[PDB]
Design a protein around this nucleic acid. Structure first.
Ligand SMILES: [Mg+2]
Ligand SMILES: [Mg+2]
Ligand SMILES: [Mg+2]
Ligand SMILES: [Mg+2]
Ligand SMILES: [Mg+2]
Ligand SMILES: [Mg+2]
Ligand SMILES: [Mg+2]
Ligand SMILES: [Mg+2]
Ligand SMILES: [Mg+2]
Ligand SMILES: [Mg+2]
Ligand SMILES: [Mg+2]
Ligand SMILES: [Mg+2]
Ligand SMILES: [Mg+2]
Ligand SMILES: [Mg+2]
Ligand SMILES: [Mg+2]
Ligand SMILES: [Mg+2]
Ligand SMILES: [Mg+2]
Ligand SMILES: [Mg+2]
Ligand SMILES: [Mg+2]
Ligand SMILES: [Mg+2]
Ligand SMILES: [Mg+2]
Ligand SMILES: [Mg+2]
Ligand SMILES: [Mg+2]
Ligand SMILES: [Mg+2]
Ligand SMILES: [Mg+2]
Ligand SMILES: [Mg+2]
Ligand SMILES: [Mg+2]
Ligand SMILES: [Mg+2]
Ligand SMILES: [Mg+2]
Ligand SMILES: [Mg+2]
Ligand SMILES: [Mg+2]
Ligand SMILES: [Mg+2]
Ligand SMILES: [Mg+2]
Ligand SMILES: [Mg+2]
Ligand SMILES: [Mg+2]
Ligand SMILES: [Mg+2]
Ligand SMILES: [Mg+2]
Ligand SMILES: [Mg+2]
Ligand SMILES: [Mg+2]
Ligand SMILES: [Mg+2]
Ligand SMILES: [Mg+2]
Ligand SMILES: [Mg+2]
Ligand SMILES: [Mg+2]
Ligand SMILES: [Mg+2]
Ligand SMILES: [Mg+2]
Ligand SMILES: [Mg+2]
Ligand SMILES: [Mg+2]
Ligand SMILES: [Mg+2]
Ligand SMILES: [Mg+2]
Ligand SMILES: [Mg+2]
Ligand SMILES: [Mg+2]
Ligand SMILES: [Mg+2]
Ligand SMILES: [Mg+2]
Ligand SMILES: [Mg+2]
Ligand SMILES: [Mg+2]
Ligand SMILES: [Mg+2]
Ligand SMILES: [Mg+2]
Ligand SMILES: [Mg+2]
Ligand SMILES: [Mg+2]
Lengths: 88, 117, 71, 101
RNA sequence: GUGGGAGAGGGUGGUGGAAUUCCCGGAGUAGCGGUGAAAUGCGCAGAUACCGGGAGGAACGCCGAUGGCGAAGGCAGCCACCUGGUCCACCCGUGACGCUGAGGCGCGAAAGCGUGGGGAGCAAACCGGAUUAGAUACCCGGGUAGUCCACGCCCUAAACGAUGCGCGCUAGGUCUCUGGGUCUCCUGGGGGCCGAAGCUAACGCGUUAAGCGCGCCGCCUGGGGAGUACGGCCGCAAGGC
């Protein structure tokens, strides 16, 4: 799955402040978390296609969120990417 | 030639014919009869009358074989099933319990085109 | 048009695949699981009762099918 | 971990040594698969519905456990290897859902 | 974000009964099967009907619904794991991050192809039996591919709601699935049915629009010729665009 613990820990990480949950950064982290989880899922199970749909979508979201952050503040974008380490 | 005297009567009733098999409390048959065990040859074995005469054959036979009480069981839906049980009602045999056993499957096997949809 | 199943029974876990005469009270004189028309449950109720019965059958607690008496 | 229930229907004809020995194998499987046992209700042998293994009745155990998710299956795999075990049923345990309270 | 929820949504491994078929055994005897009626078939090497045992495959009766889930194709025994979507309540966080989407990429019923398994029931082709004016057919008895599995291709369809996606706007009534409420009732989110205004050639549609609007993609331009020819592109092929 993903435990309560794990999700917490990743936010209590990427949050812009105390109480941050919905920040662009954070969502991007979640989506990556979730992604990697699902990609490893389809490392086996190369036949579960209906989940693949989801992967494709979660990827799309991640990408838009990234692009926005870049458009807005290139600094925190580079920083975020150079944390999660993807496509940058 | 064992003198059974208590047993099962099996009515198997198809759109095409009827068979009574008389067996013992353990299920081994004692005697039997059918559409064309009596005269009838073609379709005519389906008629309920065919069933009466057949049922009574199976009785009378079993009765000289020594039997009085029987337990009826019925497989299949078909004309003159009821007529077969009827025949047994007063066959001279005490009809202890009628019962309906017709196998239904849980959808295993793919029917002959005749029986589909 | 007799009277409806759930009306008889008191409170019962509808999840109990261990619990029988409560369960058997949901089946035909053949093994057959009973219609809502006859049981008087709800969409969800009947729905859980199903899996419950089936779980129980597999366990050898409830009958998969039965013979039919008279006829 | 998650909390399952484990039903065991085994040979109603067991003498005592034999019974306590199947029980022993069970204990061992559970430890070896990582399940802590939070309860037991053993209703013992009961009249069946339909024959199982040519037998008219069966000996009933029930174990409420909490154990490693990913291991549950292997556990059942293992529990089943005994000829003297007839049927084995594991379940994620839910909460009572009742009606007519 | 947090907290709940329903679900044949997907993949994997397991396992449960019913029925068919075949094999073993008991008992039993002369026919069963099949049709409009029949015959072919099967049966004294003892069938059928009955009881007991066994193997193997395929599909899951009742529940089952006018029901649910899914983008579509589609999805049904039970169990466990792996996972996608989606709904609600709190109104917590980000602050226009949005809509559509030519190319591209992925999915894509059935049939079909390749390689290797598997093969019970069914069953194109085929072998027979009957009907018929004949019967390359409708009915009957056999039967191979194939239906099943793995992997890789194939990319079609009455792939239908013959209704592209998003948002906003315009009476109600009623039945229902699923949430949350102070729970005869209100409030979300689906499924149906009647009907305001409006639309419509009609039939019909009508808050699940075929009404009133805006954005954006796809498409149409009389019937044949023809989804043919040629060219290109994919394809092992069949063939597809
Ligand atoms: Mg006949
Ligand atoms: Mg056939
Ligand atoms: Mg075993
Ligand atoms: Mg949640
Ligand atoms: Mg499912
Ligand atoms: Mg599944
Ligand atoms: Mg499976
Ligand atoms: Mg069987
Ligand atoms: Mg034999
Ligand atoms: Mg004719
Ligand atoms: Mg001959
Ligand atoms: Mg012969
Ligand atoms: Mg001889
Ligand atoms: Mg048998
Ligand atoms: Mg077997
Ligand atoms: Mg075989
Ligand atoms: Mg078997
Ligand atoms: Mg939908
Ligand atoms: Mg369809
Ligand atoms: Mg889920
Ligand atoms: Mg706010
Ligand atoms: Mg602010
Ligand atoms: Mg889009
Ligand atoms: Mg496209
Ligand atoms: Mg396809
Ligand atoms: Mg296919
Ligand atoms: Mg070919
Ligand atoms: Mg044929
Ligand atoms: Mg022919
Ligand atoms: Mg012809
Ligand atoms: Mg012909
Ligand atoms: Mg004809
Ligand atoms: Mg071939
Ligand atoms: Mg093939
Ligand atoms: Mg395939
Ligand atoms: Mg079209
Ligand atoms: Mg479109
Ligand atoms: Mg489109
Ligand atoms: Mg469409
Ligand atoms: Mg338009
Ligand atoms: Mg959208
Ligand atoms: Mg609209
Ligand atoms: Mg309505
Ligand atoms: Mg409610
Ligand atoms: Mg509603
Ligand atoms: Mg209308
Ligand atoms: Mg009007
Ligand atoms: Mg409205
Ligand atoms: Mg509605
Ligand atoms: Mg129009
Ligand atoms: Mg023209
Ligand atoms: Mg033209
Ligand atoms: Mg074409
Ligand atoms: Mg060409
Ligand atoms: Mg040219
Ligand atoms: Mg290609
Ligand atoms: Mg070429
Ligand atoms: Mg063609
Ligand atoms: Mg195309």
């Amino acid at each position: 799955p993903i435990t309560k613990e794990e999700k917490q820990k990743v936010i209590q990480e990427f949050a812009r402040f105390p109480g941050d949950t919905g920040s662009t950064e954070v969502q991007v982290a979640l989506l990556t978390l979730r992604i990697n989880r699902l990609s490893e899922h389809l490392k086996v199970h190369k036949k579960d296609h209906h989940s693949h749909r989801g992967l494709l979508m979660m990827v799309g979201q991640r990408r838009r969120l990234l692009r926005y952050l870049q458009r807005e503040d290139p600094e925190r974008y580079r920083a975020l990417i150079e944390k999660l380490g993807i496509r940058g | 030639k064992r003198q059974v005297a208590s047993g099962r009567a099996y009515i198997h009733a198809s759109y095409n014919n009827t068979i009574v098999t008389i067996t013992d409390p353990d299920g081994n048959p004692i005697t039997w009869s059918s559409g064309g065990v009596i005269g009838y040859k073609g379709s005519r074995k389906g008629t309920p009358y065919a069933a009466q005469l057949a049922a009574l054959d199976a009785a009378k036979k079993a009765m000289a074989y020594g039997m009085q009480s029987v337990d009826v069981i019925v497989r299949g839906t078909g004309a003159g099933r009821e007529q077969a049980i009827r025949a047994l009602q007063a066959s001279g045999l005490q009809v202890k319990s009628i019962v309906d056993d017709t196998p239904v499957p849980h959808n295993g096997c793919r029917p002959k085109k005749k029986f589909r949809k | 048009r007799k009277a409806k199943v759930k009306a008889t029974l008191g409170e019962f876990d509808l999840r109990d695949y261990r619990n029988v005469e409560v369960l058997k009270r949901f089946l035909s004189e053949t093994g057959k699981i009973l219609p809502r028309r006859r049981t008087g449950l709800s969409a969800k109720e009947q729905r859980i009762l199903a899996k419950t019965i089936k779980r129980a059958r597999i366990l050898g607690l409830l009958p998969f099918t039965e013979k039919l008496v008279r006829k | 971990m998650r909390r399952y229930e484990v039903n065991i229907v085994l040979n109603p004809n067991l003498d005592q040594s034999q019974l306590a020995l199947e029980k022993e194998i069970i204990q061992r499987a559970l430890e070896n698969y990582g399940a802590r046992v939070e309860k037991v209700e053993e209703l013992g042998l009961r009249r069946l519905a339909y024959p199982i293994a040519k037998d008219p009745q069966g000996y009933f155990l029930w174990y409420q456990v909490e154990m490693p998710e990913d291991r549950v299956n292997d556990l059942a795999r293992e529990l089943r290897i005994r000829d003297n075990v007839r049927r084995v049923m594991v379940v994620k345990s839910q909460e009572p859902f009742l009606a007519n309270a």
